[model samples]
Target chain A: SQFMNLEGKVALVTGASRGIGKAIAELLAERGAKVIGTATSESGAQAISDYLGDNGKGMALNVTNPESIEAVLKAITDEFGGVDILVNNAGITRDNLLMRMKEEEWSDIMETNLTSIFRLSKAVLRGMMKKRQGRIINVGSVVGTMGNAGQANYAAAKAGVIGFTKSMAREVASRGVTVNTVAPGAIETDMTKALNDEQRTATLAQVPAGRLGDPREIASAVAFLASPEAAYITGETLHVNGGMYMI
Target chain B: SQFMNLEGKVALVTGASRGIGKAIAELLAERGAKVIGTATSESGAQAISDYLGDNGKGMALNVTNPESIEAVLKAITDEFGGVDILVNNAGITRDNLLMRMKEEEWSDIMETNLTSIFRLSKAVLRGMMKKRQGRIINVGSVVGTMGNAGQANYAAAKAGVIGFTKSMAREVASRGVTVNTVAPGAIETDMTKALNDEQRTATLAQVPAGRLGDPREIASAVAFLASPEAAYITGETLHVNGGMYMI
Candidate 1:
């Protein structure tokens, strides 16, 4: 595909400690993009730098803080000059039924997931607008569409991200910046690590593909979206679930 | 905003008698595409012409016939010079449990929903490749992702459409041709209206948007995708549901 080429593009990915974020960082680097992978601590950042080798390095970032967001943007600009792609992959979940949910649970997920995207996207906007070209991809979840019974707080935040992506895509489309969301279904992540055999069995029964998705599947879609080939695409959600939630 | 403009484009949409297909035809017509809407019969085609008005015309189309596909392309090329956009909206559903589904049920859907798209897309390809630009938008369903208990035939066909879109997208992306899908969740259609109150209540409970989506909402996304503003987008699915399906 002509659009598969991403050579010379610089990308910044959040939450690169492990899981889906780590997979995305590795894939972007493999695709010839200079990737600045982020984690919340020195050790996590060091881990990213080790695997990334020379394509790019790792950095510590506190996504919830406005200052931290600015600093990471500055660091990437200082080292790589500018970013052509931004993948907002950092997120957290506080699962609780509607009746039992606390105020902090709701706000914590909102701040870490939704609010962080707002800050980072805004920080990256000026450079992208001036350059008249960019890719802003967010890691969303299938629950945002097919709301889980006991995950009201987490679902709301993910849903908000989709709404935010569309509004932002419309805002900067004229300047050549494209915004999109990649919504993953039930993958083998920490969130599902504790599900018993019975629970897992029940979950798989609903998916026609009948399996938990690999994190790399999510990364493949993100890499494609981040590429120039997907430039015409903005304000869309690409689902990578194995026939789990098809929206 | 510039991409929103679709002036001077000639478009063809199959299954444009009513519901989502009719909505797509009208919207594309309104956006300045010389739309040639198609139905399986003349009276049904007449209804499309009645609503589409001066922006385009309607014709009978036997989607199962290769000759019919060729004729539609030839007719549109004759009147409008060359076709630029092809909306593969003609499809059928033969819902049955996997255990009870007959061979005809499976093959009929494959022929209509999935195979017709493959044929029509190929018929329109050479012209678009020569012109170096085109839009191939397939109308898929949320069922393609989330396997319903008794929709194996319908689900498989829709899923096939997504894979077809991706492959076709890669094939002509260098020539500026794009292939994409629009998956609509439970919308306010005849199918949903016939559900019993109990069934309707259960279905609504799953939809976070709290109501069925309007067909026009689906049309709006298709129209935007058909425009030049979405030039950077290809090989992706845009979901239009009332928050019922998200991924």
Candidate 2:
């Protein structure tokens, strides 16, 4: 089974305090990767550190700030020697029609969802390239492919991440580094629990699998992409949307 | 099975003379679609018409020529009362390293593989949109995503087709039309037959399936994407590479 082994690898997961990021962090650590997770607040960081136990740790980070990102990188490198995998799982959505969307809303989403990946990935590339092996995975959304009326900013950022993944993959493939994106559709997260009944039903109707995805499903996909067996795969976006968007 | 039925629809497939195109044309006709296969030569056209028997017909077309495309579209519209499915499978590869690639080679591939889809799809859009139903499937290649060293022109043109497919799908989705791309990798065709043993071996090693994909496999994917069950799928590329290129 060349499927699920991450023994000895060091993984850094952003937004790992709760939801998909937390699931991914726990799963990777269980798979034997020394996991380092990021949260924006001390409480969230402490929660992640507690969940990760002895082999994993959590640090507070404001991904939108370059100084904060650099600080996290320095700490991870100092503690772990070097990061073997980086999962850009942190994202924010300020949904509104394109016409009614505020500039601040768009900018905030772009900074946290898209530009943070760009900044942090660049920060980690030097070490990954020197080591000649690494995995960078970005969490995207189904709406990026199947656009929604009120998610122009969110969709653009997610789609932009896919494009950036491809470009970065091409740029770094020869260095034995790989970049991939996983786009999950309507996963059962705290954010999704906030949806009204009608909104939830309409979302469920779109999914042929007849249920919303658990965060572990998304984590499983992220784990697969991060595995050594997936070295040949790069510049691709894997859709884990339960047939909601059968691309 | 959702895989079986394709009866009564009219399909127009370009480049139906040989290889993957020939296979797709036959498969669609066998599944009960009235297929109009297009070839660039009289002999090729006759061959397809004869092979398809009553369920399929053939016509001469030069996809690089806008006038030729327009004429064929007019004839198909008149005979079949407008096409329900259009497979832009007609494409050629001009392989050369980027440094050595000629401008003519780039332009020729782009004109045939990319621009022709734009022209042909524009011609069919009005009719399909009016009926509020249609399926446009473009034949792309694995090289589009996993760039090749010697096939820059082919890769760029094929990649451009994907980008265009996304844009066109969004543009026409509200009109009830779906556009998608199928990217095939290392298929057993006349094209692969041209490779020497060493090249073939190298290509085979890259394919995790340990062999070339049958042209029928490609056709099966196209047929599925053309079906009504795939109605919700648009602006996406279904990769049928047998794990050679997972992206």
Candidate 3:
């Protein structure tokens, strides 16, 4: 079956220090991909290297900084030849009511969570286009599709990812490259751990599955999009929210 | 509690003579929305009227023809005062491999499935904008997101519906009008009955739910999108495909 094998591929996962990105990196490496996982700190990079062992590599890179991104790309290219898959899995949320949202908070979230994807994708496009095969998966949120009262900035940035994914998919599809997004809803992550028990229960009730999604579930989706069976599928957003936000 | 209720509203459902359209009309009427159902044939119109009784009205409308659409809109306005909900459920599929697909087939599918939506939505916009509260749901297909080898025309039109939905949703969002698309995947309808057993099994295996979706499931999604609880959702595509295409 073409469902879960990524043998011989080189996968790059951003924000791989912890949480969903870390899980995805581990899963990709386990699935036979030579993974290059990114972190913002030296200790975080060491953690990724420890997880992947000798076959995989790890590096410190701030996605929001163009110089940091370029350096990491150059290092990966020198060591691993080129990337087969790029997972734009790094994101942050500054949850505040729209009325009180600071301009800096909005700008910072946009830069880190949204703009970084654009820059990194552009950096990787030349190689992918020349090879005529690549997978670019953006990590989006359910709030992008179903708006929340206090998540206007996050929603806008995430939704913007979908728009960008569609246009890029069209641009790169003929070159055998596919661009897609996976919008996960209420996954059990360190981020959601911050919510109170009552709030968590209320959120769980909104999900038809009556539970929080595992990070592996999200990784499985990323793996599927990266697989050969999903080549025809592009310009799409795969929602892995257990029916929390069906679209 | 705010999940599913649609009392005292008037809805206009296109292509409501049979199949998914009929299911949507029945569900909305059961939920207390006086419905105006449209069909292209007299027998189809009579079928809708008979099924829906006094709370529902039926009219003949060739969605591809501007004159026919205008006539039905006038009739709907005359009978219901104004439409609070609009379901663009009418669509057609022209299946052929891309290499052999005829221009006429592509144009025909696009006209009935995509252009009609643009025309009909524009016709209804003036009234809905004035009322400052309306739901416009466009029925899309799973093939729109996950491309099918022999369904290039169908995919293009359905995918175009999503793009149009987003543009229109953003345009009229401030006016309290919400536009969304319900992309149904592998539903058990007159359309799917023609598939061979081998084809059926292959398709079923791809769906995590392990069964063909019921038309009622699609209707339930539409009902949810049309309800007050879904106010925050716009410019979105709600997939009701039982996990066939997770994205």
Candidate 4:
């Protein structure tokens, strides 16, 4: 943990009400980074704030809305100065096969999952570029690299996140900024728990590690990438899938 | 090229008779490493020898055989002193469904692909550990991470290579030796070209990059990882599938 100390740094983690985002926000806060966790609903943000306590605050932001993004950045700058680490963890899935997929489902995922990153990354760049050091860690999915049958839209967005990450990493490497992704395989989340026994059993059969990953496992990976120890690791996706995925 | 200069370094690349392996061997040699390329057959080795022509030599190596592995290493040491870089590029496929898969199919893959890495890595460690610097780069397939229907044995072996890589990397980091895997997605090769028009079309549809990858692209990645510039990177897989796979 000493190797991953983020003392005096400020980190912004999206969708931190619960699950992997909350785990990342908590872990980053625990590692000494002044953290801000965001959620779509005010109550969820308040919940994050309650859990984070003095180490961090939580705010409401609609990631797809530029106005909301600007407001959040302004508020963070007013309180925490400027973000040192940006963890793009917020995402949604509107799963449907291609033939039956609605346009809204595809657009919503692209806007929320893909475009939000472009906006947020652009918004935070000037500060990081001026300082000559920053960490932009995106939370990607295993389905991004290995496309999922019913989650084509989600897959495309997550895959787009990596392309964006690599381009950003290349453009900013000289300034000491590192961009990377931590693609989590199936984790024991509320969403995964909701799956029927048949689905769950079928999913576990493909995973050689023989179990779902812990949220903390993913958080540790993001924390490592956020740390200065990972400065040289840019444009990389660190898959934290317990041997379920190897890339 | 200067940044990746391999002058004075001795590199041993397996399966260098053709394709990605040959590209890697040639590139490394061109970058100034005294290179030795190996093949399973003496005729293939001679062809590699002819192409290498004074820059390096070619030899036959049955990677799965302990005696063959020992002989190859001894030859390298006797002639070139010691290997500074070892590229595990040799691998085979005995593809079949699980029900029809022979024990030889499973054992062959485990020995040739997985166990060979363990043996070779162990064989070269003393020289690298003593020097306090070295590179062990393994050629992993994307199917290792994203399992294919009929490649269970191959996938398990390649995936095992990555697990072996990370463990070796962790164990050797303090000594300054780095171990990593380069997982290539769909590359244009004789094997891939053999796919029928329908198969090729379907495969291309999945790759967002819209085309198969070049062997040189994979070779370039291996070259970079083998360089001193990648010292900070260990226990990692650098996926070079163009936009086909982003992790």
Candidate 5:
């Protein structure tokens, strides 16, 4: 649809080597955005570059490190007309019961999942605000809203991203910038595929859509929000969960 | 977009006499649905009929009354192939501070805004489940999630609808029925337009989009959710707010 055709736009998706991030990067590129896919490892970056080919490029980024973020943003600015769409997709989980959880586990989740968004968005805001049009999309989780038993740290961080997105959206709305989150529930990625049949059954029981979500479904949602049609929407979290958790 | 064309579908919208309900009815009918727009009075219904003309219909209904719901459902089934899409849009506000709030004030809002959803959805479920396809979209308010100072009762009812939407969505998902909510922020309706300049300024301060939302924008969201493209989205509240609140 013309509403979603992202011609000439530049997008940056972190952790795009595989899974949901990869799918998001691919879809944005397919929609005519110049997508910059990033991965933590050189090999992962190379893999993304190989897959993206001419539609986009691949870069190595360490989201937890401020210097790495600066380097990535500078390179993006020099090459791809800066990022009109910034996707904070890179994240790690430190799952544990509250008492069993270590301080490092909690901090790691916050740094990688929560703080990275703050760093990356600040890095990209100048360019986006200057252009007077940009989208900053964060990859959040269903557990953020509906608490999970074993993911205290992960949930806290994801939940924090929602507040961060909303506050940033308020600050930047007049500048033609939008910030939003896409929270996925029980997607068919390695984390979910690792569940045993019994475990999977219990998980599927909670999902009314009768199955786990495809990576592309999450990607479709992100792409939609990244498009111009969603300009009126900001400070909003679009849940693509197949009825796993509804708010 | 072709993804949003609702050709050959039937939609019933309550409180369709004016404002957001009116806009939703007009948009759905324009999208090829046989829309049944309902109001409490004959003249109001006739005005809807006048505008819809050959596109759909106008019916008298008192959503708070179970007998009224039964009659309306029966008529829609006999005339418009039942309701493929149900929009629970009728609502009322009995605003008062908690200290001054009467029990009747609370009950009225619940009966009209919340319980009517339970009644209408149950009445329509048999047909939709039998056919293996349906959409029930509840019109929710931002105050449901973000509490308002004088709207405790209204918030509780609106908030309850979210939980209701989720549970009902779970029960009906396998039957090809999707239940969801569209929560509108400070929209450009008679309600908001009636706000004093000072009150309006305070309201706009919360909206990051720098302006109030048009009723048509909310209509666009409802139309999208009622379409096949939104099949996987159930038990969700798609906020059409202009960055007022983020969840």
Candidate 6:
């Protein structure tokens, strides 16, 4: 438990509007971090603020827009001091076959998923470097490792996130900043819930864990990486997949 | 099962001189591949040969020496055609506190542990890439990710190996080459047996499984990664730490 405890930390989690990001923000807050969660819409930001309560706050952020991103981080720093724990959880998928995939599909996935991390991670660098301690946990997916048909763009973008994490980890290790990636398997999120009964059965059959991953399971991973016990770990990728990809 | 078949495949496992390497060589052979295990000494190589029998052979190899590495690889290539599975399992640790660490200690571990993989992996790269199917699994350590205080050199080497694996995986993904790393936690090798009573007790307390891992457990993971079931997986590090570390 000592390894998983995070008290008096300031965590900024993107995409905290819902799903995995929301869970991570809440868990970090519950563990004593003041979290600033972000969303694309004011209503989503409000939802995050409502859920997060006094632990921290939330705001609208257009990750693809440099100005919007600057505004959000500026506001967050102005409000919560500075980020100690940065989780680059905001991402979008543009699933399509390589040949049939449109340019916008590829670019959108890259900008939203891969490049945004490079952006946000750099933004957190100044503060974290000054503090001489920080945690950057980027959320990826199982498909990133096990390439799926009709999802080349998503896979490439996610895979890029891992590379970014390892490279960043190496650069920051001496400075006491740890950069890691959390690649979650199929979680029972809103999108997965829409799957037909037959689809769900097939998915379950493939998972040795015998069920979809709970968003909380992914959240727990974030909490661990944000703690002092995980200080030794950097440039690492943790797969929270339910044995879907054994490696 | 198709996923488990290594029949018709040829493998070259470095550092079969002993321990985890021997275990990996034995398991891969048992799984159906024709293996060539290596050691730095003729007697140790002979022992590997004697043990492997018809499944494969063993020979002397000095991984850090360019000529020795090239010679063994050439001989193995002449006999078995080419390697489809390459395991960079040969490694040496030079432990010292960062302040006390010497240049020789750093260079020795780098040449033997990290750079050797670069050399060996490149030697096997052409055949694997041309074949449009291959698995390059690097043997990594827990200290690589979870840095040990007195083993900065060792940690750097191991961590570099993972970074190399991920980089190589990305480069050759299109050519049907899969690169991965297996980072093992504490195992009951001869090394662990030398620990003092208090040391052993503290180590056991940290391990959720309440015991040091067996070489066979690490072998099993290698076996699975080398299997067809792991075809879709690449550019990843699988931490077999017995829950000692989480995302």
Leading candidate by lDDT: 4
Q: Any residue pairs clashing in model 3, and if so which?
A: A238-B247
DockQ, per model, reads 0.38, 0.06, 0.08, 0.29, 0.51, 0.04
Show model 3 residue runs off by greater than 4 Å.
Answer: A1-3, B1-247
Runs in model 6 with CA error above 4 Å? Answer: A1-3, B1-247
Better of 1 and 3 by TM-score: 1
Residue-level lDDT of model 4, residues B135-208, one tens digit each, is: 99999988887778789999999999999999999999999999999999999999999999999998898687
Could you estimate the TM-score for every candidate?
A: 0.58, 0.57, 0.56, 0.57, 0.84, 0.55
Which ranges in model 2 have alpha carbons more than 4 Å from their true place? A1-3, B1-247
Better of 3 and 6 by DockQ: 3
* Angstrom error at residue B157, model 3: 20
| Chain A agreement with the truth for model 2, given as TM-score | 0.97
Fnat values, candidates in order: 0.91, 0.08, 0.09, 0.64, 0.66, 0.04
Which tens-of-lDDT digit does each residue in A30-140 have in candidate 1?
Answer: 888999999999899999999999988999999988888888888889889888999999998888888999999989999999999998998898899999999999999
Docking class of 5: medium
The candidate scoring highest on TM-score is 5
**Error of model 4, residue A110, in angstroms:** 0.4
Candidate 3 lDDT over residue span A88-126, tens digit each: 998888989988999998998899888999999999989
Of the two candidates 1 and 6, the one with more favorable DockQ, higher being better, is: 1
Candidate 3: Cα lDDT at A245: 57
Model 4 / residue A150 / CA error / Å:
0.3
User: lDDT: which is higher, 2 or 3?
Assistant: 3
* DockQ value of candidate 2: 0.06
Error of 2 at A150 (Å): 0.9
Report the poorest 10 consecutive residues by lDDT, candidate 5 chain B: B1-10
Tens digits of per-residue lDDT, candidate 2, A124-150, equal 888999988899999999988888899
Clashing pairs in 6: none
Task: State the lDDT at B214 in candidate 5.
Answer: 82
